């Protein structure tokens, strides 16, 4: 009662990973991302895969 | 009075009305950021001192 | 002697595939091989130019979160597939438009893109979408930009007509770099050493030229130390 018109708008937001987001496995090891490090600063194996 | 949905929004420039249609509702597929008008609504207001 | 070093030279490119190569630098003195290898790996993996898809315009599509009749993949999946397009742009052009028009059932691949001769597609077999009907038709306008690094759609400075879909661009063509420093047989000495750099890329960027740009960047940033003074 008393309502004339309802307009509903749906917004799609793409949320990327960033520091502060909670990420976890299946064994109870949860954590918060602290840094988005560059690829060149990651440890790499003998084949160069970081 | 009765609140009306329209594109004639007082004290708002044409920049914020770009994504609105004639009916006052944002287009489908419009990329909107914070503070952008999606539905333009105007409500009658009483005398203000 | 002791105060004079041996300047390394480029001696071999081994092109294992179109996306994998090996470059040999020789001769290198003791310790210099590791230093040069690490410096070149860090510069190559982070600061090398390329060409990436930045804007896509598909007829009859208003936003990525929609579907097109006759196309199995959603528009978001099509954009994700276009992100993996390896495009080489001729020098002097930082902005190209390439069109993709197709009708009929079948996969739509990168070899079906019409370009004006200034754009080369390195992976024509890359799959963009699938057309599942004989009446299905797709018509897309793809924008290819020259850049460096990773520029997401949000980070791009802000009119934009509805229908123009912004695609996150990873301009860096280098994917994997691995350097191995081994013994080299030069004259009679046993102290000179050899650097082998294995580059896994998208095929857009040549190995030798990439090494030269990396060396140019390293020397240009070193010039500040070479001319150390209070600025």
From Swiss-Prot, chain B:
Belongs to the RNA polymerase beta chain family. The gene is rpoB. This is DNA-directed RNA polymerase subunit beta. The RNAP catalytic core consists of 2 alpha, 1 beta, 1 beta' and 1 omega subunit. When a sigma factor is associated with the core the holoenzyme is formed, which can initiate transcription. The chain holds residues 846 to 894 of 1341 of the full protein. DNA-dependent RNA polymerase catalyzes the transcription of DNA into RNA using the four ribonucleoside triphosphates as substrates.
Curated annotation (Swiss-Prot), chain C:
GO terms for molecular function: DNA binding; DNA-directed RNA polymerase activity; protein dimerization activity. One of its GO terms (biological process) is DNA-templated transcription. Signal peptide: none annotated. It catalyses: RNA(n) + a ribonucleoside 5'-triphosphate = RNA(n+1) + diphosphate. Residues 1-229 are annotated as: Alpha N-terminal domain (alpha-NTD). It is an enzyme of class 2 (transferase). The keyword Nucleotidyltransferase applies. Keywords: DNA-directed RNA polymerase, Nucleotidyltransferase, Transcription, Transferase. GO terms for cellular component: cytoplasm; DNA-directed RNA polymerase complex. Its EC number is 2.7.7.6. Homodimer. The RNAP catalytic core consists of 2 alpha, 1 beta, 1 beta' and 1 omega subunit. When a sigma factor is associated with the core the holoenzyme is formed, which can initiate transcription. Belongs to the RNA polymerase alpha chain family. DNA-dependent RNA polymerase catalyzes the transcription of DNA into RNA using the four ribonucleoside triphosphates as substrates. The N-terminal domain is essential for RNAP assembly and basal transcription, whereas the C-terminal domain is involved in interaction with transcriptional regulators and with upstream promoter elements. This is DNA-directed RNA polymerase subunit alpha. It comes from Vibrio cholerae serotype O1 (strain ATCC 39541 / Classical Ogawa 395 / O395). The chain holds residues 4 to 238 of 330 of the full protein.
């Amino acid at each position: 009662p008393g309502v004339l018109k309802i307009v509903k708008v749906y917004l799609a937001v793409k949320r990327r990973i960033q520091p502060g987001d909670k990420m976890a496995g299946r064994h109870g090891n949860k954590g918060v991302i602290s840094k988005i490090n560059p690829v060149e600063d990651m440890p790499y194996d003998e084949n160069g895969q970081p | 009075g009765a609140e009306e949905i329209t594109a004639d929004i007082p004290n708002v420039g044409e920049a914020a009305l770009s994504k609105l249609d004639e009916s006052g509702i944002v287009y489908i597929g419009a990329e909107v950021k914070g503070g952008d008008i999606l539905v333009g609504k105007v409500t009658p207001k009483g005398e203000t001192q | 002697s002791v105060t004079e070093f041996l300047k390394p030279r480029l001696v071999d490119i081994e092109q294992i595939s179109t996306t994998h190569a090996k470059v040999t630098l020789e001769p290198l003195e003791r310790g210099f091989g590791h230093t040069l290898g690490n410096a070149l790996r860090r510069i190559l993996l982070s600061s090398m130019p390329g060409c990436a898809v930045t804007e896509v315009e598909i007829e009859g599509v208003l936003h990525e979160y929609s579907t097109k009749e006759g196309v199995q993949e959603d528009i978001l999946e099509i954009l994700l597939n276009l992100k993996g397009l390896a495009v080489r742009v001729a020098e002097g052009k930082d902005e190209v438009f390439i069109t993709l028009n197709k009708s009929g059932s079948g996969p739509v691949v990168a070899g079906d893109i019409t370009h004006d001769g200034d754009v080369e597609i390195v992976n024509p077999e890359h799959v963009i979408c699938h057309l599942t009907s004989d009446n299905a038709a797709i018509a897309m306008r793809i924008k290819v930009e020259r850049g460096r690094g990773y520029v997401p759609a949000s980070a791009r400075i802000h009119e934009r007509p509805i229908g123009r879909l912004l695609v996150d661009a990873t301009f860096s063509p280098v994917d994997k770099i691995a350097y191995s420093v081994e013994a080299a047989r030069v004259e009679q000495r046993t102290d000179l050493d050899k650097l082998v750099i294995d580059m896994e890329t998208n095929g857009t960027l040549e190995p030798e030229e990439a090494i030269r740009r990396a060396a140019t960047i390293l020397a240009e940033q070193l010039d500040a130390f070479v001319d150390l003074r209070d600025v």
